From a paper:
Hemagglutination inhibition assay, ITC analysis, and glycoconjugate microarray revealed its strict specificity for β-linked terminal galactose, but not for GalNAc. The primary structure of AJLec was not homologous with that of any known lectins. Accordingly, AJLec was assumed to be a novel type of lectin with a unique structure and specificity.
The crystal structure of AJLec in complex with lactose was determined in the orthorhombic space group P212121 with unit cell parameters a = 38.1 Å, b = 79.7 Å, and c = 106.0 Å. Two polypeptide chains were found to be present in the asymmetric unit, and a total of 164 amino acid residues per polypeptide chain were observed. There are two disulfide bonds at Cys3 and Cys122 between the two chains in the asymmetric unit. Therefore, the dimer structure, formed due to the formation of the disulfide bonds, was supposed to be a functional dimer in solution. The dimer structure forms a helical-bar like shape, where lactose binding sites are located on both of its termini. The protomer structure of AJLec was composed of a core structure with seven β-sheets and three surrounding helices and loops. The seven β-sheets formed small jelly-roll type β-sandwich folds. A lactose molecule in the site was bound to a Ca2+ ion, where its glucose residue was quite solvent exposed whilst its galactose residue was mainly buried in the binding site groove. β-galactose residue in lactose is held by two coordinate bonds with Ca2+ ion and two hydrogen bonds with side chain nitrogen atoms of Arg64; hydroxyl groups at positions 2, 3, and 4, and oxygen at position 5 in the β-galactose residue form hydrogen and coordinating bonds in the site. In addition, the Ca2+ ion coordinately bound sidechain oxygen atoms of Glu141, Asp150, and Asn151, and main chain oxygen atoms of Met147 and Cys48, present in these sites.
Author numbering:
A (entry chain A), B (entry chain B): 1 to 164
The structure:
């Protein structure tokens, strides 16, 4: 029902944990093709290493190890856990120890950004958001089952979209 | 860029006449969903009343009768002659004598604009431009079979798209 945006897609807060296959899953209120989403932090912190508070963040694992420049670790998928955001604008940390974990950065944002904008890139037919779609906000280490056991926290957010 | 810049959709110039069911037809070189197209005049002129060269234009019928301010009459359709551009941003001339002819204006452009940008509005599934698609650049009086017999000319253009 909406062209452009931002338009709020969620009803209730969308809340994700950092382990245990616990994404924040919801049925979007509006249909169409999305250019991007904007995640607006409401409450909570997650971390990829619970032995310290140093990495606690909205969207990832801040100031961690050797990759302070790849602090993000949130992915918005469809109901099949296929990533829809980000698909552009993100650079990934590629060291083999944690390549599969998919830590990333987006220039202009960090893991403490009050609002995080993630780009879809251009659309293909199967990217349509319809009545049957579900979006899932995942922590990457949870999604990929990489080193999740030492994670903790829970973040709640609103999710806005921009339709094209 | 392929996703984000003007992308040339045609190869050879796209040439349309103003009568005789003679749109300029082509299969786009790139697939996906468009926000807009840009038509770039290359050569030729068309008119909606051939008794003089007064109205000869790139995109319509310039300085004609009652509708100097609605001089445009080009439409980009799919292979079933369904209009895809413009679908927003166009103001139609509604005088009963020529309402069906679908003369229109777009702010900041006229029928001699070297380039004309036409907006699609937001996309639905059936707006996909794929390998089976054919885009057609029509003269409106020819598309709608309204007062076409006194038309003449042929315009050739390049056609660019903005993918989303
Ligand atoms: O290197 C970044 C990586 O650290 C993981 O934690 C390691 C921890 O540092 C190490 O002492 C322990 O032996 O193994 C842990 C992994 O099982 C974090 O879990 C991971 O999220 C990354 O941040
Ligand atoms: O009124 C705009 C309309 O004019 C049509 O031409 C008229 C013409 O002016 C009239 O003298 C003739 O006898 O009837 C024509 C229509 O069949 C143009 O063809 C049309 O394109 C409009 O520009
Ligand atoms: Ca971890
Ligand atoms: Ca998991
Ligand atoms: Ca005519
Ligand atoms: Ca015709």
């Amino acid at each position: 029902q909406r062209c452009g945006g931002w338009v709020k897609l969620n009803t209730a807060p969308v809340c994700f944990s950092a382990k245990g296959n616990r994404p924040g899953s919801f049925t979007p209120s509006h249909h169409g093709f999305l250019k991007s989403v904007k995640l607006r932090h409401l409450r909570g912190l997650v971390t990829c290493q619970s032995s310290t508070d140093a990495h606690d963040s909205y969207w990832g694992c801040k100031n961690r190890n050797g990759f302070h420049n790849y602090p993000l670790n949130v992915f918005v998928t469809d109901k099949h856990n296929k990533v829809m955001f980000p698909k552009t604008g993100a650079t990934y940390y590629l060291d083999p120890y944690v390549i599969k974990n998919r830590f990333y950065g987006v220039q202009g944002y960090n893991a403490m950004s009050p609002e995080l904008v993630l780009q879809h890139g251009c659309n293909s037919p199967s990217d349509y958001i319809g009545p049957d779609s579900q979006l899932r906000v995942w922590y990457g280490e949870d999604l990929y089952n990489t080193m999740e056991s030492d994670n903790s926290g829970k973040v709640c957010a609103d999710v806005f979209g921009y339709f094209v």
